[model samples]
Target: QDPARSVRHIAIPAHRGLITDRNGEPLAVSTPVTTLWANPKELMTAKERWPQLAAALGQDTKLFADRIEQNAEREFIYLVRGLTPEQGEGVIALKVPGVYSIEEFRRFYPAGEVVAHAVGFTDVDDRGREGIELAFDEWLAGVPGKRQVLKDRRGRVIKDVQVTKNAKPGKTLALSIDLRLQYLAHRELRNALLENGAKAGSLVIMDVKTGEILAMTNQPTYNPNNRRNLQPAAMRNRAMIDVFEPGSTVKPFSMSAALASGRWKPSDIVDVYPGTLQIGRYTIRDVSRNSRQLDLTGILIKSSNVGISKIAFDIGAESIYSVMQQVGLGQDTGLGFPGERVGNLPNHRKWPKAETATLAYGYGLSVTAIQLAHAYAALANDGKSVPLSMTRVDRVPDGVQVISPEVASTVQGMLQQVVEAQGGVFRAQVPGYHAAGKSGTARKYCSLFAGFAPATDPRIAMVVVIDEPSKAGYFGGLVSAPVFSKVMAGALRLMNVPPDNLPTA
Candidate 1:
């Protein structure tokens, strides 16, 4: 409403609300500090007073003298930040001629590196630059007030009053993110990245009931405070921003779509016919050559490419594509993240036979880690699809019904076999809980796993992604399964979730 006071850019210290775990464990907070700024115009015209000013400020006389060498056209320049209260007071007491010490706040992550990907960081200007900060800048930015200063002709005395505009504090946003789970997930992924000699890694954990993001992490993440030496590739959050062929972990969705359409039954049997299945000139083969005719459950347990392809063929691309649409494929997740992307999912009208074949085993299409997790959550919740949420939701989310409860239950049972059956994703299993999910390995990009536990009243769901992991057995089972087990165990234990069967470690 105020024209002259319209702010193009105002450097207000971002005093964000406390970010904590679900149990109120502090994750990120603002530390009291002082920032030093200089009105260059005043300092320039008062050049003769530089020596006394330098003496008062207790700054290097030569350095203070050199500061005036900058463009004389500029009005303001900064000196330093993050000074303690005592330091600020000491500098102020010196009555430095041109320098002004303003009490400012800087964000500090107590957990440090553990939840860095989720909490994000701000720039020196207090601008939200990347991660959650960039995603929720508007909500995190405080409304600046307008003030006018009036001075006498002598410019010696002045009276200032707050104008018509009033300052509004930044919204205190609550996240569905559980910091404990976030920490555990980060720890596991960090270890995996180091052990596998991977270039990078990312992990995301979600709550199925409310679609809350329990954790999201990426390895080689830069500390917000120290970004000078950051690598561009390492800073990219692969789970939300990168897209790749999901490889095998995407099998569950294709199979679930077939079952949901009523064209396939849980007890359905398919002739897998060894490992290789030829589609035109291209051949799709399972990693293991010892394939045979298997039922729906067996296909999931073994992650059979041929078996999943047969189901995709039965259901057809149109039906599966519809389900993907219902679950937010090829669409923004509405989290308002700055770099968020919707991966490619071929439209029903444009589906080609080769594309369909490639899509069957997760080759032709692309998806983000978050999309994969949301798809699995739909399968977990009787085909009811909920949008993923990073912030806390106060009311029940209106979800889309992608498939019937019967169909969802059938897929759930089959997915369970993926974990329960011997030599399946046994590595993904928690000591005393029933877990259901799939592992994925995509070449040149990432290997991933997506799963959820305590099938009934499912509390937590998650996905693990490792980029450019070596050929040293870096499939979802090998890299991500163990992380899933560890994080799920910690999350369950933190919530005091009783185990379904107290199996001994």
Candidate 2:
């Protein structure tokens, strides 16, 4: 019999799949690495060499010796993991009796903080921990292979015995995200957040017709490549997980309800002589004091709180609530993202007059940035609410008809007025394209701007939310619209969407 006759079973790790963008650009990938482990029982024989091992690992010699002593009964312990080839070789050169190195993989993010929230990261064991990584863990993680081999007392494999099981590699995941747009959105949002001195911010870009998320980013982001200083707060996907009052961004939904009720028209007039509407003990006032009689289009262009309150009352709570619900308020966007928030859309059955009136202008309701983006996507898609998706869609998805095509068209036209009409969101206008959007400046320092580009044939819908912007201007048009313009301009160019309007002088 051979001197090394002992047989051992060992696991061969399967490589995790790559996460790539729609165009095949790598976002997350597994990189080859080595993990150093030890057999405490075997290490005891060479206890005096613990200092040399500790020096190589950058650990204190006494502490290293103490850990080995504490774990003396254990057969295996990890000295360190995720070491470079050079580092692993250095440790191997020490020829520590019980110390050994095994090949493994570590997750790397090429986009770093730009796609951090969407791509997420993995744990030390190479398991998905957050974001899409967690969402598709089962599909992205492969089964480990097992093999039996003959080994000597030195732990060296002398002969292969048998292959017990074959490793199944993980399948690649292709996301709907366009890396170009993602990079653009990230750069623009970071610039806005930094320039405005905001607490945090989020932005989402989606295919108007398909409802596929093209790019999503958040501020205070982290580099998934570096896990040492990973902060829980920075790991949050704010676009899907954080919710806030959407403010005037919800006005379009209220207006759509009024039109769908057959009780109001695009040309309908509302009196705003005093510019304030008293509802129970609460009062709704416009941001500007205007005594003029404003029409429906004027109401939205001006974002008049008093004007929209009247329309909400005219449409009745049931109609207003129904419209809001149709546009995806108070519900998840169905992305299946971990820790996603559905936001608060209280039932209107028990709503008091003040609450109902406030709900019209987005005061009583809350929404995630993606939820708002989906709502705008529905409006852009002619009142059809399509299911939002993180992965690629092969065919055009069917959507629920939330309102009449006429109603959606009217709202789209009015949104354009918000960008073209003086005193509207002039900053949201793209140089060579017709854009339609709404600006919102909510209480508690939340700023929002949501809209679609090339109003004649909308292709993309986007939303920008700036949380607690303390410097620069706090209003959505002032703080958020410029970011919208910059991102949309690049996205349109990248997508080759034709310019519908002349460039601004």
Candidate 3:
């Protein structure tokens, strides 16, 4: 042991990797920052100068001294973290012997709240806490390196030593999200939520052919850059984690089951006169009491709960449940999103008659917005169910056939009528593209609209759900359809998808 020689090891913090959009725009990136720390043993000598140091750090001198004294036996303690350049310089200028500034990294979100829920923020120590950050923490966080140095008793570096370990930077991650559509979806969904005075809302835009989510956003979002007073309510990725009764959005799937049973056709008639059907203690009624008979297509166009219940009872419960299961209800999406929920779908054998009837029209069940979008994507993909992806995909996904192409085509044609028919969804129509979708307004003001655009040959599928809209209108057609239209129109144009109904010159 040489009395004049001292040895110390310092940690060299590794740089965290970047998270980029599909087009390579940065979403979450690490920026260099300085953290102030102290050697408690050395700091005791400067106790009287604590006041000047506290002034530089913007802290109470007595409180600061007390904290140092309490931790006097510890080797090191943090004085403050994430100081600015000027702040770090000011603190260093005082020459407080034990005080030292070490370079570290802090996460920065350039897009702020626009992509906060997608690319989560990191803690002061650069550990991921939520969103994609938490989901891929190990992949994004790198190994820290260590360096040994020789120093004198005066705490001055006497000579350079060896690098004990080399730092390895984190691997960069490329996400499937398109930032262009993300910003567009964010703006439209936010505008709709504010305009309707809705409590919350969510929208999902998917590549129908690829099953990749292009854009997904939720209302009541928080800026990750400024995390003070952040609430759990604002941090939730509602599209993937929150479940709600889908209402009539489930009707098309029920219709698919009916067609697959060979017991119903698009033109087959169901007498919906008086429009109310009694099932046990509960009575199901349509919004409009019509005296005319409704075909399978007409039932969807008019959104007749009584008509759908008749088909559900006729086809039996197992068949209906089979269709839902094949389309991915009551199952995990397999995207591995943090806190993703598998919505409730009751077993068919346990369903009472009333439960079966209500299930036909989207009650007695719950689904996340992403699940609903996934089901619709299967419909738009000609009845092929493909896995959804959050990261960039290299190959075409293999699909499981959920329904026959013939049945999917027939239902697709009928759904188009739901938008273009005389008594159907007029608000969902795009100016130059054919739009096909169904509108649903559940109890307690849950509104939903889901469909695909350029219906002749679809390119994109989208879903919009507005919760507790309290302003101008609460109906799905009134509130959610317009947002669907706006987002689809922009997405279609951005994708350069040829319009199915462009006028001739």
Candidate 4:
């Protein structure tokens, strides 16, 4: 008897969806691959030739021989995985009765670590694990199906039996990430981390007008296709998931309270004699900006904490807190990403003057890089708070107006002064474009820069957060602003947004 032909139901895995950038460049895709498996019983019946299978698997022949001998009682034994069709052919060439190769799908990332945190990687079964993959798992994962088939003794499919279940492939997902921006952002962020000897960092670039995130990248990233030495810290989408106490970067938003109070104008002056202010048992200090009388714009250009704190006292704490809320402080960005951290914005009934003072200059609060980018986008978008999106936006819904166009425009001008008018943040300047942004050196060991490009017609809003620079530059202007400048400059050019200013020789 040939003892080979048989009818059986085989499990078939459904193909996972394709993940691409806004331009439909592949970010992640299922590549056709082959898996080597064996029916231990059938293999034992034919007997011997196990050495050839072991060799194909790259395992010592005797080692696999011992494993198969010990587990021989089991019907199925997975020999190897993640092999190309050509690689699987070597084992099939042996033509052993028990040996079989099954066509399977393997996830491949085109840009690897560059887009790792944004797109995420899949598990061996093609299951969504992290990042966007985990967020839209149900939509991207199709149900596995079963098929009725005829297989000869060698376990090769001879002919199709009655149709059983049909496999439904998943739909394609086009994300908002611009691979070009992602690569440039990755290069700049990694370089910043290296040059500053920083612990870690995250960067986010967004279309302020469209609310679409063009790029989000994190340092300490790993190649999604490789996990041999992967760590949990390196796997998180830090820009979305991690939060920190932002420093002076909040000056523009905090000043919104001052301007809204009507007691102060952009030209209004505040005395910062000796650059220090005492709040009972606490104190606030500043860099020797060499000016005692500073205007609201000058306070921002000099990042005068004492100046802003005095304004905060004059404006009251509740008002400042309201401005923070309007600017989206302490709120989860609604990204649907797992483990996203929303920093805290407290509501004290009394609203202590000292705490209010700290809050005015960005203490007593925390924010994610994405959150900061989103907030700045509102300022750059003429006071409309648009929800940040991960997918390519076809129709931009209406935005929530957070501040008046006048105040928004005025604050925008002050930030441009910080970059253009020889202010505290000169590093944020994009040579051919007028860039408006602020730098923050949080003693909490986070360096940050948040701003938008072409100042007048803001196209993209970006933030760079470099954590804990060692033995050197920890100031946001020194450590993080360069990253913002390089990445934003590249992104502006990539989007072909015309430069607003012409640099003179």
> Which candidate's lDDT is highest?
2
TM-score against truth, every candidate: 0.88, 0.93, 0.94, 0.92
- Residue lDDT tens for model 3, 413-467: 8888899989889899988988899999854367899999778787788999888
Error of 1 at 120 (Å): 1.6
RMSD of 3: 2.6
Mind giving the per-residue lDDT tens digits that candidate 1 earns over 437-459?
88878653677788887755567
Global lDDT scores for all candidate models: 0.73, 0.87, 0.86, 0.84
Per-residue lDDT of model 2, residues 357-441, tens digit only: 8888898688888989999999999889889999887787888999789999999999999988887888898988999999998
Predicted structure 1, TM vs. truth: 0.88
Ranking by lDDT: 2, 3, 4, 1
| Regions of candidate 1 where Cα sits further than 4 Å from its true position | 1-18, 21-23, 38-60, 69-82, 151-165, 502-505
| Range of the 10 consecutive residues with the lowest summed lDDT in candidate 2 | 150-159
Better of 1 and 2 by TM-score: 2
* Model 2 misplaced regions, further than 4 Å: 1-10, 47-49, 149-160, 503-505
Instruction: List model 4 lDDT by residue over 1-505, tens digit each.
Output: 6676868897788788999999999998889999888777677766467776677678997788777777776655788887999888877888888777888898899889999988987888888888888887887878777889887654555677766888788878999999999999999899878878887888999999888999999988998888888687788788877777876888788787778778878888899878999889787988755779988888887888999899989989888888778778888678888778888887898988888888889888987888889999999998888888999999998999887888889899889988877556887879789899988876447888899988988889998888888755456678887788899989998999997886643
Worst 10 residues of 3 by lDDT: 151-160
Scored by Cα lDDT, where does model 2 land? 0.87
